[PDB]
């Protein structure tokens, strides 16, 4: 049994908000293969950070890969309150995880998306005249409520979407705005890997 790593570079990567959360159970993994396949631009794993996570055993392994421009690495660094960490994605420092960046040349089998996208404004309009605008921050590890307007990706920068949330969601209109960075010449990938210790279910182990 092996922890299939083909899926990370399979097909077109998604945007930052619509990440594909990933899980491994009772398998065998080799992070060095991913490191060799992808030329790493920056490496800032925090917490346990044993210069890598390829020797410890875990109950499960989580990957939160997305396609991100290297220009914006700072917003997703810890202790930021930018648009990315508010409406797009915030790293879950409550549990063992860390941060990985890389880029992809033409030698790889990966297909570039149309363009890089991220959410700029995700608000809740309430009150008569729809006047109070109350931003919806996102808890770490959770999809934004504004993801579903354009899951695959945003067409152009400056898209004004809208939806009326049900009484369960809290009520009021939900306005989502997306931003589109023009596509870079070379493709880039950003990974956030989460590792979880099993007290009595420590199955996933390195080869």
């Amino acid at each position: 049994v092996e922890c299939d790593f083909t899926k990370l570079l399979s097909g077109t990567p998604p945007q930052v908000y619509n990440f594909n959360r990933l899980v491994f159970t009772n398998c065998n993994y080799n992070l060095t293969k991913l490191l060799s396949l992808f030329m790493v631009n920056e490496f800032s794993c925090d917490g346990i950070s044993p210069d890598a996570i390829a020797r410890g055993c875990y109950s499960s392994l989580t990957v939160d890969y997305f396609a991100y421009p290297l220009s914006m690495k700072s917003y997703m660094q810890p202790g930021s309150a930018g648009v990315i960490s508010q409406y797009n994605y915030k790293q879950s420092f409550a549990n063992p995880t860390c941060r990985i960046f890389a880029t992809a040349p033409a030698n790889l089998t990966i297909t570039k998306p149309s363009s890089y996208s991220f959410i700029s404004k995700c608000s809740r309009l309430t009150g008569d005249n729809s006047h109070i605008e109350t931003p919806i921050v996102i808890n770490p590890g959770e999809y934004s409520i504004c993801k579903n307007f354009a899951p695959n990706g945003f067409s152009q920068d400056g898209d004004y979407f809208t939806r009326q949330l049900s009484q369960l969601e809290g009520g009021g209109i939900l306005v989502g705005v997306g931003s589109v960075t023009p596509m870079t010449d070379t493709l880039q990938m950003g990974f956030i890997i989460s590792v979880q210790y099993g007290t009595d279910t420590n199955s996933v182990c390195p080869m």
Binding site: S120, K121, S123, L125, N129, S130, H131, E133, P135, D157, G158, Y160, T162, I173, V175, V177
Partner: protein, 725 residues
């Protein structure tokens, strides 16, 4: 003695001189004598020469206009001027160095360009050619391209389409420069789905097949153009890379439906203040956005949004007013309506929702002309409680209870209507007057409000007019059940209260319109009163705009109801006066005096003998969305379809049998289409009402061609003379 004849009017025999100047610096301005651009020194007035009369720059191309560079090293010369709409045109521009004396012949501005402007300081040009924006950092240097997505009649980059130009902006330019000129901010309008209006242009005796003119025109309730706002950094333009623009999105309270962009204003050199309007023009959000050096974007914060609601009607006199920021950029002064319903200046902080009104009373401020560090200058109709008079005041920013009138006691008998032009840094200002007497221009020093000199006294015209019989003018009020409503009468020469006089009643009756003010004029009414001995009265009923938000907002969602009955009651009140002949009473107006005239004649009152409707509005669903939806809402069965269908001229056609009607319209009209008059005429033919009609070929809304402007008034002055026997 003579009188004021139709020849004296159509030929401009008596011509009012102007004094138009351009403040290039804090103490110097550029007047223009015979053909010479002369630079004047404000404090002394000694007038050295800037450019001699020898204008053979292109040697044959007549220079339509010029635009000196802010630094003064270049002059922009325009020619080949072709007009499109009221504010639109295309021309050709050539630059001419003043440091050298050589016309620039390299990297020229293309022949058919729509709008060209200089930077506020320095020498940069931004021009719109074929719906695209170009920048020239140096006049003799190849241009840079910013927008590649411009198409004719679909997408406008840096210029406005018909509807925004006509109503939302009242200008053809949608590109704005930073106080440096570092950034250039422009708007993109998208007319993909707005329906087109098609009319015929015959265009010559030689053109065998008449042309069809197709304009993107949203009629009331139709699809409406979208807006995108971008800001581009001019200081980082290069040939190797196509330019990048940063888009600024509207606040999410505007993104839930359809919205406009009604104002753009720069606060600091890194802070732009955008101001949006919801399609139902009850709501408006003003957004202060700060350029972020690290991000490179423009962050529009939520805590700085200033929302203005109008519960009893639309917001703004015609659109929400612009801020007047301070030097620091952390506060601004804006004219908003107070609790009593009178529009006054209230002092805002950037990051605080509340503001503090600094002026109050039973009057309205019209504009904030200039904001000095220690003073604020504004135009108000406070003086003597006359809504039809404007004056200039200053208010101390340290103490708001110290207000001085800088233009109240200069010449009370001759000037009561003022407009000011302020120098840079507000150290000098020119007082342009058009009050009861002849216009009078003076220059003043702002240091201690000294009166320097009289630039233009209009003394030649005074001597010319001392030998003609000129009409008087009366400006008084009548009371309607509690309130004060102001009217005016152009009284004939040697007016006698015992004699009976015919009455013609000039109408606009537009929402937020002043028709009884103190401005001096020489127009068709002067002919009527002088030669024909006809009283030409104008009335301010409900819906007028400088008397409060209780008078102006009374016609909210009720166009054609109070505007029309107030004029009939005004005519009845005038008839109660001894001098008006009740049998000969007529009404007329230009398109909204036209709408109101048609509605008044088709009402069965019996007051008016006859009426002239010029380019009238017929049905409010034939008109553009920005104007009509402001005052009436959407033509849907939920919102206001009932009064959209109950306020038509056509459904009043059976009462036109007691009236004499003259219906005039230009067949190439783009604003109030020929469809209006065609559908009026069809509705009066279908019921058997006799009337007179006249079409003007190839003419737009404001019939202005010298031959046609001479023809229409000669036709109308014959119809009136036939009415009044």
């Amino acid at each position: 003695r003579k009188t004021y004849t139709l020849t004296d009017y159509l030929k401009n025999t008596y011509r009012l001189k102007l004094y138009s100047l351009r403040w290039i610096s804090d103490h110097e301005y550029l007047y223009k004598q015979e053909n010479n651009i002369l630079v004047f020194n404000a404090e002394y007035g000694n007038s050295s020469v800037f450019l001699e009369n020898s204008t053979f720059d292109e040697f044959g191309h007549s220079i339509n206009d010029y635009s000196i560079s802010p630094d003064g090293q270049f002059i922009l010369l325009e020619y080949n001027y072709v007009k499109q709409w009221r504010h639109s045109y295309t021309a050709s521009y050539d630059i001419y160095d003043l440091n050298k004396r050589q016309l620039i012949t390299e990297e020229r501005i293309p022949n058919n360009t729509q709008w060209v402007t200089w930077s506020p300081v320095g020498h940069k040009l931004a021009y719109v050619w074929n719906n695209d924006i170009y920048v020239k950092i140096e006049p003799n240097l190849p241009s840079y391209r910013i927008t590649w997505t411009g198409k004719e009649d679909i997408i406008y980059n840096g210029i406005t389409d018909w509807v925004y130009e006509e109503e939302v902006f009242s200008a053809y330019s949608a590109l704005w420069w930073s106080p440096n000129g570092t950034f250039l901010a422009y708007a993109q309008f998208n007319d993909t789905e707005v329906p087109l209006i098609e009319y015929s242009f015959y265009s010559d005796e030689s053109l065998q097949y008449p042309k069809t003119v197709r304009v993107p025109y949203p009629k009331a309730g139709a699809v409406n153009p979208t807006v995108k706002f971008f800001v581009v950094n001019t200081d980082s333009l290069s040939s190797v890379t196509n330019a990048t623009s940063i888009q600024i999105t509207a606040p999410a309270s505007m993104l839930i439906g359809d919205h406009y962009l009604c104002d753009v204003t720069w606060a600091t050199q890194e802070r732009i203040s955008l101001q949006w309007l919801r399609r139902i023009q009850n709501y408006s959000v003003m957004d202060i956005c700060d350029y972020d050096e690290s991000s490179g974007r423009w962050n529009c914060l939520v805590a700085r949004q200033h929302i203005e609601m109008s519960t009893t009607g639309w917001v703004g006199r015609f659109r929400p007013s612009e801020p007047h920021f301070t030097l620091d950029g952390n506060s601004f002064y804006k004219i908003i309506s107070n609790e009593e319903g009178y529009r006054h200046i209230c002092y805002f902080q950037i990051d605080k929702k509340d503001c503090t009104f600094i002026t109050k009373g039973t009057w309205e401020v019209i504009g904030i002309e200039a904001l000095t560090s220690d003073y604020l200058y504004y135009i108000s109709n406070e003086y003597k409680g006359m809504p039809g008079g404007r004056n200039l005041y200053k208010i101390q920013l340290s103490d708001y209870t110290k207000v001085t009138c800088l233009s109240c006691e200069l010449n009370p008998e001759r000037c009561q209507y003022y407009s000011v032009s302020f120098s840079k840094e507000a150290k000098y200002y020119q007082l342009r007057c058009s009050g009861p007497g002849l216009p009078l221009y003076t220059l003043h020093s702002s240091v201690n409000d000294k009166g320097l000199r009289v630039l233009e006294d209009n003394s030649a015209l005074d001597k010319m007019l001392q030998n003609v019989q000129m009409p008087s003018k009366k400006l008084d009020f009548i009371i309607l059940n509690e309130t004060k409503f102001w009217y005016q009468m152009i009284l004939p020469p040697h007016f006698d209260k015992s004699k009976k006089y015919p009455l013609l009643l000039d109408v606009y009756a537009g929402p937020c319109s002043q028709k009884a003010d103190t401005v001096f004029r020489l127009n068709w009414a002067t002919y009527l009163a002088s030669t024909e001995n006809i009283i030409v009265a104008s009335f301010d009923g409900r819906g007028s705009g400088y008397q409060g938000d209780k008078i102006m907002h009374a016609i909210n969602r009720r166009l054609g109801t109070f505007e029309v009955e107030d004029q009939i009651e005004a005519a009845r009140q005038f008839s109660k006066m001894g001098f008006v002949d009740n049998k000969r009473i007529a009404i007329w107006g230009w398109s909204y005096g036209g709408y109101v005239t048609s509605m008044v004649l088709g009402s069965g009152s019996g007051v008016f003998k006859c009426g002239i409707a010029v380019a009238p509005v017929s049905r409010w669903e034939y008109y553009d969305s920005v104007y009509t939806e402001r005052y009436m809402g959407l033509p849907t069965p939920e919102d206001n379809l009932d009064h959209y269908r109950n306020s038509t001229v056509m459904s009043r056609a059976e009462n036109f049998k007691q009236v004499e009607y003259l219906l005039i319209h230009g067949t190439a009209d783009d604003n109030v289409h020929f469809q209006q008059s065609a559908q009026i005429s069809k509705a009066l033919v279908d019921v058997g009402v006799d009337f007179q009609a006249m079409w003007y070929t190839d003419e737009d809304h404001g019939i202005a061609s010298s031959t046609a402007h001479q023809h229409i008034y000669t036709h109308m002055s014959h119809f009136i003379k036939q009415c009044f026997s």
